[PDB]
Amino acid sequence: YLDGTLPGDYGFDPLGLLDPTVSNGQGAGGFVNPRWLQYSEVIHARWAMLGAAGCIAPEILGKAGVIPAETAVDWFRTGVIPPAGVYKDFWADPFTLFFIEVVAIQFAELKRLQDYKNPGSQSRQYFLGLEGLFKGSDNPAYPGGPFFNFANFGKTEAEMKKLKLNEIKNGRLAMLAMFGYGAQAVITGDGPFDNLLAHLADPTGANLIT
Amino acid sequence: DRPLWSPGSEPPAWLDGSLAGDYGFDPLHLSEEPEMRKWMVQAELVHCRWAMLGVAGILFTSIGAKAGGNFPDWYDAGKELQKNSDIPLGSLIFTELLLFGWVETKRLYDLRNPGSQGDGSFLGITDGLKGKENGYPGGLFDPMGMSKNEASFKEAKQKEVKNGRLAMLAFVGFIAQHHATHKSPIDNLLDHVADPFHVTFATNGVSI
Amino acid sequence: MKDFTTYLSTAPVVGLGWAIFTSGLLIEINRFFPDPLVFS
Amino acid sequence: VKIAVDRNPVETNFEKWAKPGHFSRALAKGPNTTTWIWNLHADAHDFDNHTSDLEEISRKVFSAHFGQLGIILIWLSGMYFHGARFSNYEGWLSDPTHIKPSAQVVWPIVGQEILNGDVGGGFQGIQITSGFFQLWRASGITSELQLYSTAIGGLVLAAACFFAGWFHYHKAAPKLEWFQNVESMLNHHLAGLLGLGSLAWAGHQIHVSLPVNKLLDAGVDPKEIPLPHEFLLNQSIIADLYPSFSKGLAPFFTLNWAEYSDFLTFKGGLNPVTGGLWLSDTAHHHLAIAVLFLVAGHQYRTNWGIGHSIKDILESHKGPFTGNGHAGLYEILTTSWHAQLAINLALFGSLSIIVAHHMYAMPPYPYLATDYGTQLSLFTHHMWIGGFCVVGAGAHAAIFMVRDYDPTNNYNNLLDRVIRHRDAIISHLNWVSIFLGFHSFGLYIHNDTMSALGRPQDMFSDTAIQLQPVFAQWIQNTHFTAPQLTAPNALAATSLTWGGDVVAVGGKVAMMPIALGTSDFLVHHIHAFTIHVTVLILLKGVLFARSSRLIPDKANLGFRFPCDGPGRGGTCQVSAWDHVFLGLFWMYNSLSIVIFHFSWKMQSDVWGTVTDSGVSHITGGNFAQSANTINGWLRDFLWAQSSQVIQSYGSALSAYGLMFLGAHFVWAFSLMFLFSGRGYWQELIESIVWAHNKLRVAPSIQPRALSITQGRAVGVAHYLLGGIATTWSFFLARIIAVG
Ligand code: CLA
Ligand code: CLA
Ligand code: CLA
Ligand code: CLA
Ligand SMILES: CCCCCCCCCCCCCCCC(=O)OC[C@H](COP(=O)(O)OC[C@@H](O)CO)OC(=O)CCCCCCCCCCCCCCC
């Protein structure tokens, strides 16, 4: 059933979770279906594309002389998992920031979900004049618009398909990387860049086998 | 055709939009029947109007206490004012329960039967004391002619409800950030304005 | 809601409300004016 | 093999809540008699009778099972919560021997408060006998905050369970194909649930249950203990306790596992301090068990195409004497739920009976053997649960023969050949029951008659015509002398019941060798007599459910019917349902004896306070001499141990004295239902309806007497409840007031 029309189709579905036989009826139903799984693949990817860039950027810039070493700290010692460590000097405590985090994100998430449940619904109701930017599109993952694609890149359809899968190939790689950051940190107890600096120095001596 | 509490949600069938402060908010399917809907709009307004009347009493005293006047906290105010009063407790309660049973009962029978109290039995009053709508009387409770115009009466109903929902949320606030800080509401305000980043609900020692 | 109120009007549910009333009333009548035997 | 779901089959609304009886065609009409009410609560969960569709029956079952889990998880979270806020766990943890557990504080109303006994630890409440305190100590639990979180987790997971049942039924419900993927279910249930489940537990025991109970047993105060999470973070702390933790997984991946000998052990026996199993041994057990179930889960060929096929395995084990054997069973099991339920209940009940024997001799959780009320309550519970479950197999197997039995699939099969020599089964089994009851129970009467006549030399006893169980005695020594020869690396034996020395804890013995004699020979046989008969009643009902010589057509009458008629001399209680109704009384009688045996034996020969000069048992070791006579079981067990219950008025055990009487009332009350019949009652109601009619106060729902089948069910229910609740009062009051 994998025709290959999709961007990131390379014929790898051993378990058969994307088949159209499952969820035969019509309705909302369950999460496992082509409409939701395709949507969650890029969401995981984009969030991970941001995370893997940010988990290693302060450490790299810290080894370099640009950023102060006080701020340059391992991604797991910056406030998440306070047993690991906690940055004392922010402009507010973590829990105050979490209520900021939750609120400002709840808006963005719920609104996106509402868009998935009923397309174009968020433009119809007044939202502080920002309704023109949320018109959406046929597909729930690639809305586009005056903001999300403010610089219209793929005016041609063929150029979009090339970008639509470069978003995935560069993205599915990042998801693996963050899975490496978590596993590296537990065993090594050090940042991801310092672990790289060791394998380049003593590869045979610094390794998972060790 | 109008705003809603969650954009994109289909509003219920029974909430047409004529009522004041209608945003299609009833997931429990309450007020689905006409008779219960006729009862709840009157329950919402009294819970509102008592909130406005009460919360203003708390701000007036808590501000007068912060300025220097002799006013106590809204909490533990009935305990310190009864210690030194000529009116015992029990004579003050059943002066309130007995006097409200008159009003609260007359309001009930206007609900069950509109226009019933305007018969002229009570001291020969007929044109007043008959309801204009369910929870919106007039004549005597509207001395100023601020309701003899449907254009300016329909939006005033929207302001009575919007400043009311907000008001009875505030009373829940006073309960909550009293139990945490055991201070007045105004004192909690000046602290947040003094050091907004540091003094929040996270740093009160409670709720964590 | 018409069907919910009808479910609440069944026998198992109305009896549950009766039991909480009669038992709640008697236990409350023993908590205050404790352990009565003779009626004044 | 693949996933298959049908979207939004059923709408969710309260419309059918208002219309009871919707599931059945007969009940949807409405009530004109009061019999409609009893039929409603009865046929509610009989999904096979509602509809013929096997798919809908599967959707209903898979979603109802999600309910029992949510019902369990709030119950389980309640114990954790009630143990956190209304208990003495922190006090008991610091002085376990002297302080008693208490998780049920009572309110202050008329009377009542006296039940809040002086438990100890600055606390007063009801003394529990569930063993939760020893369970929470076997794991790393020192504070009440760990119990609160554990409770909030259950409510969260329980709502998820309940949500799942609505989701898996009302929104996205699987298809019949998803349910028949039986091979897939076995691999996931074996490897995933039992395998990883046990491997996970090992992790917790290794990182929390071992680093905490080592300090607690060394006298350290609980508040000074380092918290369960800190041990994971610091590899230096746990290394001080177990130095093997300093090497860190290199021994594992290099296959040098001898380094982990510090915490992975084969000690055997019991801890001298706690009177419980070595916690290091259990981590080794559950670790071992995971590797065993993991390989088992890679057996069936679900979708990869490599492995065994259940059908090919069944239709290949054939024999001459059997003919066509095991052939048409894969079609049965994949089509009828009652077949699987009967098989599952038989092993799920016989397992809880194994849990009861393998816990008392091998006390796993610490400070359990010294809490005799706890050790006696767990045994009596898991044993009763086994009897019910076993009897359910005989009921839920007869339903298969009546409803889900197609003779076309079964020709010269194992199931067909069993029916064709059924009269040989029941006949040969009838002879055994008569053989046992004479040679076993008749021995008891011989001892009674000999004693009353003044001929005690002629009794069956130790000082007498001894009948000693040589086979058991030989097995005790073999398992006792095993560490020398058959299990050299074993430091000691599995339990001290086989042989050895006493293990004393807090001045009380946890376990000591049990000696078997002439009395233990009669009782062990008495049990077989009660088991062979209980099988005769159920097995007879199964085979003769579909047809008999008296009634060649029972299957058309159905599973439960009272009687065909007063003809043939009488046909009342001929159905398979009425065989289950009879097996319950026997099953209850058999289980009760297996409980008296545990109480008098362990009180007299095992339990007691250890002094400088030996042990002083509770009943002075009277099981050997008195048990041989029936009057001994009346004098030394009943007329003696009933003193603590009777004299409970005016103390915290007063509730047991009431339940002791209340249980007798409900037991007798059942006799009205079993002895009489629905004819006398229906006529009496007519004379009552006249008075209610005379005053124009009469029900439109006509009153009708209870149905014959219901009358019998109502009897055995009030009968078992009163028979079982008496012991529940006669035991806990006896044992809590020790001796
Ligand atoms: C693209 C991702 C990525 C990258 C670039 C690295 C790179 C590195 N890792 Mg790392 N790691 C990763 C993923 C990654 N890892 C993942 C996913 C895990 C969890 C399994 C780990 C767990 C891990 C540990 C525990 C350690 C490292 C270490 C290291 C460093 C030395 C190499 C070594 O000895 O480990 C090689 C270890 C491996 C597990 C290599 C195989 C991982 C492959 C490349 C990615 C996964 C393939 C994927 C699962 C295939 C798809 C199948 C799936 C659909 C079923 C090096 C900088 C070591 C270190 O700190 O350096 C001193 C160290 O101790 N890693
Ligand atoms: C403990 C055993 C027991 C008990 C309690 C009873 C009780 C009763 N029998 Mg009876 N009976 C029994 C054994 C018993 N029988 C046996 C072994 C036989 C021979 C098989 C008979 C044969 C028999 C016959 C032929 C008749 C009776 C009748 C009666 C009733 C007579 C009227 C009366 O006394 O008012 C009531 C007496 C009471 C003790 C009240 C019982 C209920 C109490 C008050 C509990 C209250 C409920 C409480 C709230 C708990 C409810 C909770 C629960 C529902 C969850 C009576 C209720 C006669 C009858 O029909 O009455 C008109 C009648 O004709 N019996
Ligand atoms: C959840 C489990 C459950 C349980 C334990 C019961 C139990 C009962 N139901 Mg039932 N019910 C249930 C679920 C349940 N139901 C469900 C799911 C439905 C579908 C909506 C119904 C619908 C239903 C109907 C339509 C009826 C019952 C009736 C009854 C009662 C039988 C009549 C009787 O014997 O007393 C006989 C009573 C007298 C002779 C005189 C009246 C005095 C009574 C005893 C006082 C009231 C007792 C009170 C209800 C007890 C509290 C509830 C208790 C379970 C804790 C009985 C107590 C019948 C009833 O009338 O209820 C009382 C009845 O008509 N139920
Ligand atoms: C209404 C039924 C019922 C009830 C009310 C109880 C009540 C109780 N049980 Mg029990 N249990 C039952 C049925 C029941 N059980 C059955 C049928 C079995 C046979 C498997 C068991 C096996 C069992 C064991 C082994 C233990 C209890 C224990 C307890 C007591 C502590 C409660 C607890 O949370 O411990 C929680 C129990 C554990 C943390 C350990 C459970 C270990 C078992 C072996 C897990 C097996 C689960 C497995 C997946 C299901 C069987 C697989 C299948 C192939 C057979 C408590 C008094 C414990 C106790 O003695 O209290 C001190 C105890 O160790 N139960
Ligand atoms: C617990 C001790 C119980 C022993 C006494 C019970 C005796 C009553 C059983 C008599 C039925 C005789 C008819 C056989 C029925 C029959 O003819 O079936 C035929 C069967 C041979 O089968 P085939 O090899 O031809 O076919 C097998 C295939 O059909 C597989 O499905 O016989 C046996 O299996 C031997 C059974 C001996 C049964 C007695 C032993 C049962 C207890 C198990 C332990 C025994 C050893 C204990 C010592 C430690």
CSV table of C-alpha atoms in Angstrom, one decimal, chain D residues 527-706:
chain,number,residue,atom,x,y,z
D,527,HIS,CA,-8.9,-34.2,52.2
D,528,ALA,CA,-8.7,-36.6,49.2
D,529,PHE,CA,-12.1,-38.0,50.1
D,530,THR,CA,-13.6,-34.4,50.1
D,531,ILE,CA,-11.8,-33.7,46.8
D,532,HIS,CA,-12.7,-36.9,44.9
D,533,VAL,CA,-16.4,-36.4,45.8
D,534,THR,CA,-16.3,-32.6,44.9
D,535,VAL,CA,-15.0,-33.8,41.4
D,536,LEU,CA,-17.8,-36.4,41.1
D,537,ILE,CA,-20.5,-33.8,41.5
D,538,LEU,CA,-19.1,-31.4,39.0
D,539,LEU,CA,-17.8,-33.9,36.5
D,540,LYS,CA,-21.1,-35.7,36.5
D,541,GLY,CA,-22.9,-32.4,35.7
D,542,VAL,CA,-20.6,-31.7,32.8
D,543,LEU,CA,-20.8,-35.0,31.0
D,544,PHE,CA,-24.5,-35.5,31.6
D,545,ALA,CA,-25.4,-31.9,30.8
D,546,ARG,CA,-26.1,-32.5,27.1
D,547,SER,CA,-28.0,-35.7,27.5
D,548,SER,CA,-28.8,-38.6,29.9
D,549,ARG,CA,-30.8,-41.8,30.1
D,550,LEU,CA,-33.4,-40.2,32.2
D,551,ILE,CA,-33.7,-37.0,30.0
D,552,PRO,CA,-32.3,-37.6,26.5
D,553,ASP,CA,-32.8,-33.9,25.7
D,554,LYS,CA,-31.4,-31.5,28.3
D,555,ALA,CA,-29.6,-29.3,25.9
D,556,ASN,CA,-32.9,-28.0,24.6
D,557,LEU,CA,-34.0,-27.2,28.1
D,558,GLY,CA,-30.8,-25.3,28.7
D,559,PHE,CA,-28.0,-24.8,31.2
D,560,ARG,CA,-30.1,-23.8,34.2
D,561,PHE,CA,-33.6,-25.2,34.5
D,562,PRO,CA,-35.2,-26.5,37.8
D,563,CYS,CA,-36.8,-29.8,36.6
D,564,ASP,CA,-38.4,-31.5,33.7
D,565,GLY,CA,-41.4,-32.6,35.9
D,566,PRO,CA,-42.7,-34.9,38.7
D,567,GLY,CA,-42.6,-37.7,36.2
D,568,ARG,CA,-40.0,-40.5,36.0
D,569,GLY,CA,-40.4,-40.6,39.8
D,570,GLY,CA,-39.0,-37.0,39.9
D,571,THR,CA,-36.5,-34.9,37.9
D,572,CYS,CA,-35.7,-32.1,40.4
D,573,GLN,CA,-32.0,-30.9,40.4
D,574,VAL,CA,-31.0,-32.7,37.2
D,575,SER,CA,-29.5,-29.8,35.3
D,576,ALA,CA,-25.8,-28.9,35.3
D,577,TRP,CA,-26.5,-25.7,37.3
D,578,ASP,CA,-27.9,-27.8,40.2
D,579,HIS,CA,-24.7,-29.8,40.2
D,580,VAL,CA,-22.7,-26.6,40.8
D,581,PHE,CA,-25.2,-25.7,43.5
D,582,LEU,CA,-24.4,-29.0,45.3
D,583,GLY,CA,-20.6,-28.8,44.7
D,584,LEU,CA,-20.4,-25.5,46.5
D,585,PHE,CA,-21.5,-27.0,49.9
D,586,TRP,CA,-19.0,-29.9,49.5
D,587,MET,CA,-16.3,-27.5,48.2
D,588,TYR,CA,-17.0,-25.3,51.3
D,589,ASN,CA,-16.9,-28.3,53.6
D,590,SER,CA,-13.6,-29.6,52.1
D,591,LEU,CA,-11.9,-26.1,52.3
D,592,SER,CA,-13.1,-25.6,55.9
D,593,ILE,CA,-11.3,-28.8,57.0
D,594,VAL,CA,-8.1,-27.7,55.1
D,595,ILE,CA,-8.3,-24.6,57.4
D,596,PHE,CA,-8.9,-26.4,60.8
D,597,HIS,CA,-5.9,-28.5,59.9
D,598,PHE,CA,-3.7,-25.4,59.5
D,599,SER,CA,-4.9,-23.8,62.7
D,600,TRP,CA,-4.6,-26.6,65.2
D,601,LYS,CA,-1.4,-28.0,63.7
D,602,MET,CA,0.4,-24.7,63.7
D,603,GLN,CA,-0.8,-23.6,67.1
D,604,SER,CA,0.2,-26.9,68.8
D,605,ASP,CA,3.3,-28.0,67.0
D,606,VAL,CA,4.8,-24.9,65.5
D,607,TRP,CA,3.8,-21.5,66.9
D,608,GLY,CA,4.6,-20.4,70.4
D,609,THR,CA,7.0,-18.3,72.6
D,610,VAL,CA,10.6,-19.5,72.8
D,611,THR,CA,12.0,-19.6,76.3
D,612,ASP,CA,15.4,-20.6,77.6
D,613,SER,CA,14.2,-24.2,77.9
D,614,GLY,CA,12.7,-24.9,74.5
D,615,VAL,CA,9.4,-23.6,73.1
D,616,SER,CA,6.1,-23.3,74.8
D,617,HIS,CA,3.5,-23.9,72.2
D,618,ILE,CA,0.0,-22.3,72.4
D,619,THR,CA,-2.0,-25.5,72.9
D,620,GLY,CA,0.7,-27.7,74.5
D,621,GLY,CA,1.0,-30.0,71.6
D,622,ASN,CA,-2.4,-31.7,71.7
D,623,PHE,CA,-2.7,-32.4,68.0
D,624,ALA,CA,-1.2,-35.8,68.3
D,625,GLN,CA,-3.5,-37.3,71.0
D,626,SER,CA,-6.8,-35.4,70.6
D,627,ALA,CA,-7.2,-35.1,66.9
D,628,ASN,CA,-7.7,-38.9,66.4
D,629,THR,CA,-11.1,-38.5,67.9
D,630,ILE,CA,-14.0,-36.4,66.6
D,631,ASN,CA,-14.8,-35.4,70.2
D,632,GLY,CA,-11.3,-33.9,70.3
D,633,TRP,CA,-12.1,-31.6,67.4
D,634,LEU,CA,-15.3,-30.6,69.4
D,635,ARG,CA,-13.5,-30.2,72.8
D,636,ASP,CA,-10.0,-29.0,72.2
D,637,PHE,CA,-10.6,-26.9,69.0
D,638,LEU,CA,-14.2,-25.6,69.3
D,639,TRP,CA,-15.1,-25.6,73.1
D,640,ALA,CA,-11.6,-24.3,73.9
D,641,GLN,CA,-10.6,-21.7,71.2
D,642,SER,CA,-14.1,-20.2,71.4
D,643,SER,CA,-13.2,-18.6,74.8
D,644,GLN,CA,-11.6,-15.5,73.2
D,645,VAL,CA,-14.5,-14.8,71.0
D,646,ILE,CA,-17.2,-15.3,73.6
D,647,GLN,CA,-15.4,-13.1,76.2
D,648,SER,CA,-14.8,-10.3,73.6
D,649,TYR,CA,-17.7,-8.2,74.9
D,650,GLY,CA,-16.2,-5.0,76.5
D,651,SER,CA,-13.0,-5.0,74.5
D,652,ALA,CA,-11.6,-4.0,71.0
D,653,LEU,CA,-12.5,-7.5,69.7
D,654,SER,CA,-16.2,-7.0,70.4
D,655,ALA,CA,-16.9,-6.8,66.6
D,656,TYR,CA,-15.8,-10.4,66.2
D,657,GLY,CA,-18.2,-11.5,69.0
D,658,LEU,CA,-21.1,-9.9,67.1
D,659,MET,CA,-20.1,-11.3,63.7
D,660,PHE,CA,-19.7,-14.7,65.4
D,661,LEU,CA,-23.4,-14.6,66.2
D,662,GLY,CA,-24.5,-12.7,63.0
D,663,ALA,CA,-22.9,-15.4,60.9
D,664,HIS,CA,-24.9,-18.1,62.6
D,665,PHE,CA,-28.2,-16.2,61.9
D,666,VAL,CA,-27.5,-15.8,58.1
D,667,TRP,CA,-26.4,-19.5,57.9
D,668,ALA,CA,-29.7,-20.8,59.5
D,669,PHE,CA,-31.7,-18.2,57.6
D,670,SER,CA,-30.6,-20.0,54.4
D,671,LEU,CA,-32.4,-23.1,55.5
D,672,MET,CA,-35.8,-21.6,54.8
D,673,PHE,CA,-34.8,-21.3,51.1
D,674,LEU,CA,-33.2,-24.8,50.7
D,675,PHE,CA,-35.7,-26.9,52.6
D,676,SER,CA,-39.0,-25.2,51.3
D,677,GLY,CA,-40.4,-24.6,47.8
D,678,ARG,CA,-41.9,-21.7,45.8
D,679,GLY,CA,-45.4,-23.2,46.1
D,680,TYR,CA,-46.1,-22.5,49.7
D,681,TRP,CA,-44.9,-18.9,49.3
D,682,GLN,CA,-46.9,-17.9,46.2
D,683,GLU,CA,-50.1,-18.9,47.9
D,684,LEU,CA,-49.2,-17.0,51.1
D,685,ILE,CA,-48.7,-13.8,49.0
D,686,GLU,CA,-52.2,-14.2,47.6
D,687,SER,CA,-53.7,-13.9,51.1
D,688,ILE,CA,-51.5,-10.9,51.7
D,689,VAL,CA,-52.5,-9.3,48.4
D,690,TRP,CA,-56.1,-9.4,49.5
D,691,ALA,CA,-55.4,-7.1,52.5
D,692,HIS,CA,-53.3,-4.8,50.3
D,693,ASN,CA,-56.1,-4.9,47.8
D,694,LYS,CA,-58.8,-4.3,50.4
D,695,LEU,CA,-57.3,-1.0,51.3
D,696,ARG,CA,-56.7,0.0,47.6
D,697,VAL,CA,-53.0,0.0,48.2
D,698,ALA,CA,-51.6,-2.6,45.9
D,699,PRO,CA,-48.6,-2.7,43.5
D,700,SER,CA,-49.2,-2.7,39.7
D,701,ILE,CA,-46.1,-4.8,39.5
D,702,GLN,CA,-47.6,-8.1,40.8
D,703,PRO,CA,-45.7,-9.8,43.6
D,704,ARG,CA,-44.4,-13.2,42.7
D,705,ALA,CA,-42.4,-15.7,44.8
D,706,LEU,CA,-38.7,-16.3,44.1
